[PDB]
C-alpha cells in the first residue's frame, strides 16, 4: 500500500514551495509588464510570453501534485496527458524563442540590410507564429504517453492513480532522447555559437574603437550575451539529465538511496528550470536603459 509513496521531508516541501512562490510572483509580473511594453522586439515578446505561459501552467499543478510529499494524482486521465503536453509545448517554445532571438540579433548586428530584407515585420510575426506551432506539434507525443495508471499493488487502492508513462520503456526512452536532442542540444549549439561570434564582433569593435560609455556598453553587452548561454546551460541541463536518468537506468541499479536522491533532484532541477522564466526580464533591464525606464514606468 505504501510502496507508491515518496518520503521527502515536509520542511523541504515548504522551502521549495516558498522558492516556487517567489519565482512565480517575480516572473509573472516581469514577463507581463515587458510583454505590454513590446524586429528584435517581436522575438523578445514571444520569449516573454513563452516564459509567462510556462510559469502559469507548469508551476501550480507541479507544486500541488508533483513537487510535494504526496504521491496520488488528481487531474484525471485526460489531465495526466494535458499537463505534460502543455509543459512540453512551453519548453520547446522557450528553447526555440531563445534560439530565434539569438539568430535575429546575429542577423541585425552582422548583416543589417538583408536582415530587414528577409525578416520584415510581417515576416517576423509569421516566423514567431510558426515557431509556436512547431513547438506545439513537437509536444504531441506526450499526449498518448503520460497517462494515468493504478500503480497500487492491490490495483484499487485509495491512491492507485498516478501520472506516469504508460508505453513500454523502449519508446518512452527513445522519445525522451529525441526530446533532449531537439529541445536542448540543438538550441544549445545554435545559441552558443551565435552568441560567441557576436561577442567576438563586439570585442573587435571595442579593440578598434580604443569613449566614456561606449566601451562600457560593449563590454556589458558581451558579458550579458555570454551570460545568456551560461544561464541557459545551467538551468536546462539538470532537467534533461534528470529525465534521461529516469529513462535510461535499469531496474537492478535502482536502490532506496537512489530513489530518494532522484526525488530530491526533481525539486532541484525544477527550481533551476523555473529560474529561467524569471531571469529574462532582469537581463532585459540590465542591458538597455531605455527599456529599463519604460519597464519601470509601466
Amino acid at each position: 500500500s505504501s510502496e507508491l509513496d515518496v518520503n521527502t521531508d515536509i520542511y523541504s516541501k515548504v522551502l521549495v514551495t516558498a522558492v516556487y512562490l517567489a519565482l512565480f510572483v517575480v516572473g509573472t509580473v516581469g514577463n507581463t509588464v515587458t510583454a505590454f511594453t513590446l524586429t528584435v522586439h517581436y522575438h523578445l515578446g514571444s520569449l516573454a510570453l513563452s516564459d509567462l505561459l510556462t510559469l502559469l501552467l507548469a508551476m501550480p499543478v507541479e507544486l500541488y501534485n508533483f513537487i510535494w510529499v504526496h504521491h496520488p494524482w488528481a487531474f484525471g486521465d485526460a489531465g495526466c496527458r494535458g499537463y505534460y503536453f502543455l509543459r512540453d509545448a512551453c519548453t520547446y517554445a522557450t528553447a526555440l524563442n531563445v534560439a530565434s532571438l539569438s539568430v535575429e540579433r546575429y542577423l541585425a548586428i552582422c548583416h543589417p540590410f538583408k536582415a530587414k530584407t528577409l525578416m520584415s515585420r510581417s515576416r517576423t510575426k509569421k516566423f514567431i507564429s510558426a515557431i509556436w506551432l512547431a513547438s506545439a506539434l513537437l509536444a504531441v507525443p506526450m499526449l498518448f504517453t503520460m497517462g494515468e495508471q493504478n500503480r497500487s499493488a492491490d490495483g484499487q487502492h485509495a491512491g492507485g492513480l498516478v501520472c506516469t508513462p504508460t508505453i513500454h520503456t523502449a519508446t518512452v526512452k527513445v522519445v525522451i532522447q529525441v526530446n533532449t536532442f531537439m529541445s536542448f542540444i540543438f538550441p544549445m549549439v545554435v545559441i552558443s555559437v551565435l552568441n560567441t561570434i557576436i561577442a567576438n564582433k563586439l570585442t573587435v569593435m571595442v579593440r578598434q574603437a580604443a569613449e566614456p560609455g561606449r566601451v562600457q556598453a560593449l563590454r556589458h553587452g558581451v558579458r550579458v550575451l555570454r551570460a545568456v548561454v551560461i544561464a541557459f546551460v545551467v538551468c536546462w541541463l539538470p532537467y534533461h539529465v534528470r529525465r534521461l536518468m529516469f529513462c535510461y537506468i535499469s531496474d537492478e541499479q535502482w536502490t532506496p538511496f537512489l530513489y530518494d536522491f532522484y526525488h530530491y533532484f526533481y525539486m532541484v532541477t525544477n527550481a533551476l528550470f523555473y529560474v529561467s522564466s524569471t531571469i529574462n526580464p532582469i537581463l532585459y533591464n540590465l542591458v538597455s536603459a531605455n527599456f529599463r525606464h519604460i519597464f519601470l514606468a509601466t
Binding site: E3, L4, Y259
Partner: peptide
C-alpha cells in the same frame, strides 16, 4: 521501487 514522476 522505480520512480514514476517524470
Amino acid at each position: 521501487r522505480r520512480p514514476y514522476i517524470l
